Write a protein that binds this ligand. Structure first.
Ligand code: THF
Ligand code: THF
Ligand code: UFP
Ligand code: UFP
Lengths: 315, 315
């Protein structure tokens, strides 16, 4: 079946998985070094063994693709995955007075009955970055996030590098190059950073008219984080394949620390007793070819019929 | 046997290998996406199926390790691997007059009886960058090469980043981090560059007191280039393992375009009819622990007994 490299990954984290200490320390079974391979010509790689929302996949990827850094497109697209970083830095200094989130995520994860303050204060904040322009401009611009790595790398003598747009020139100009890489790993910025990019590096590759893409992810969340990660870069591989007028080959997912938090252990086993169903397929707008000027409804998924979703604690 | 991930790689480039057009176009059988794994606790990974000079491995790696960019340490260490870049840019503009190398490598590869000019002119040039300081300073400093990526990354507001030295702090400070990466991929510099780094990215990892290292190499030369590449980063993994007082785990070699030039085809088959012999072992100086202040004779290889070497055309 198609998402079986994955199910196997989770089986292997469990079976050869070493027990780790870690930054978020709940604990983690981890392996080091792991490659998976998905043929995208046999179907779109989103998981049929659990309801994954493809809608959050698309809006997060087109944010990136527009080179955006503002949490407002995302909220304005019902998409909240990145709120806690900009909210982390709204709790910042000035302006903010009242109540008091003095490291919050983990605290409503060793939960109070207070969670409603946290979320009636978050709904105050998500309203302001999409009503107030001023607000949004200073408290919604995450800064360095993936849209400004791919599409606007800052140079030592003032400029910005759209590296994505230049590689897309490079596949159209010279299919057969071995230098086709986009990197979010920026040395000076990484000891400051909040999250140093989990999806470090990628390389496209052409052969015989179909492109493959390979991904290096330095840390991975096997249960909650990898399923989503699999569909972002494989939608990006059909999108770029669409713009250069090229077919689709494989998505190769190389990992560095792949890890199962141990409180997901019972959930990972459940979905492992499920049987994969046939893959979903992807339909893109066949008129519109500048993917950078794509919106939501241009990307479409046909017949995705999942098993039920497995909610399990982590955020 | 230990170097068998490799032999298998070459077998697979041959068997599933797609035929490519390429930059150096002689031609190439290429695969896309390939991971190999070497347990360094069962022996040092240099090839017993052909005499690989470990002496060029060590001097190239300690150049890097001192953060050097000058071709003189290397020559002064009988090591010529990088001459053609600095010589390429001695043929540059001014100074150089006489004879005339108007893209040379490939020309004494579609050979004249002229090769002696090329090399009596190269022996003029290797003499000057190690007698003349002035010479060496402007025509030997390659610039951006791996020693100035690892150890002195230039920042947008004036400074330099020793990223290697800071990760080595990070393994000593916090073994268990998932952010332990060194990258030679620098966006602004890559469309200028001569060779954009073939060895893009690496990530160290600790588990249970032994470190692993994972490597992303965007393009690879399977026959002439990969055997050497395997031993540089696996010597680096025993060196760093030595400095943090840590054991040695595995070297993981992830690849992007792995490719066999077709004129090496007959040679790759020859060594594939050879039988691997037991692995070589590595001895490091047990007093000296600052690997950055290592020289040659501190690194040692015990009982490396190869098959004969397979010279085959490419440079
Ligand atoms: N504050 C923060 N915490 C994070 O978990 C997080 C973040 N920022 N920055 C980006 C990533 C994204 N991580 C996430 C972790 C899990 C889910 C998740 O479980 N998805 C659910 C939805 C459930 C929900 O959010 O309640 C799914 O099953 O669909 C979302 C984002 N990440 C890492 O530092
Ligand atoms: N001009 C140039 N050409 C290159 O081949 C080269 C270079 N620069 N820059 C760095 C790398 C290194 N590539 C090399 C390719 C092969 C051998 C090699 O075959 N090693 C031999 C020694 C034989 C000899 O050199 O005559 C061995 O078997 O030991 C050396 C370096 N590389 C890529 O652009
Ligand atoms: O989409 C996601 N991608 C991802 O990489 N993580 C992870 C994995 C790991 O648990 C953490 C990053 O840890 P570190 O900062 O030490 O890499 O967030 C979480 C997500 F939900
Ligand atoms: O040590 C070596 N490492 C290496 O990466 N190459 C290669 C592989 C490929 O043939 C070329 C780089 O091509 P490109 O510039 O298109 O990546 O040099 C050659 C060597 F000898």
């Amino acid at each position: 079946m198609l998402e079986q490299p994955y199910l196997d990954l989770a089986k292997k984290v469990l079976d050869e998985g070493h027990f780790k200490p870690d930054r978020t320390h709940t604990g983690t079974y981890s392996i080091f070094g792991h490659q998976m391979r998905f043929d995208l010509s046999k179907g779109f790689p989103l998981l049929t063994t659990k309801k994954v929302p493809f809608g959050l996949i698309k809006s997060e990827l087109l944010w990136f693709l527009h080179g955006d850094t503002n949490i407002r497109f995302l909220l304005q697209h019902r998409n909240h995955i990145w709120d806690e970083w900009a909210f982390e830095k709204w709790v910042k200094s000035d302006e903010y007075h009242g109540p008091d989130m003095t490291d919050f995520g983990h605290r409503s994860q060793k939960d109070p009955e207070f969670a409603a303050v946290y979320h009636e204060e978050m709904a105050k904040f998500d309203d302001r970055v999409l009503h107030d322009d001023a607000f949004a401009a200073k408290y919604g611009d995450l800064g360095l996030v993936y849209g400004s790595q791919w599409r606007a790398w800052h140079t030592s003598k003032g400029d910005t590098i759209d590296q994505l747009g230049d590689v897309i020139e490079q596949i159209k100009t010279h299919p057969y190059s071995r230098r086709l890489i986009v990197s979010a790993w920026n040395p000076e910025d990484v000891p400051t950073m909040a999250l140093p990019p989990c999806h470090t590096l990628y390389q496209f590759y052409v052969n015989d008219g179909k492109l493959s893409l390979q991904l290096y992810q330095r840390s991975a969340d096997i249960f909650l984080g990898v399923p989503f990660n699999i569909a972002s870069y494989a939608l990006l591989t059909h999108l770029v394949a669409h713009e250069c007028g090229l077919e689709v080959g494989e998505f190769i997912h190389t990992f560095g620390d792949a890890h199962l938090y141990v409180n997901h252990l019972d959930q990972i086993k459940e979905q492992l007793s499920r049987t994969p169903r046939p893959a979903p397929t992807l339909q893109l707008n066949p008129d519109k070819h500048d993917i950078f000027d794509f919106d939501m409804k241009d990307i479409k998924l046909l017949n995705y019929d999942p098993y039920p979703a497995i909610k399990a604690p982590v955020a």
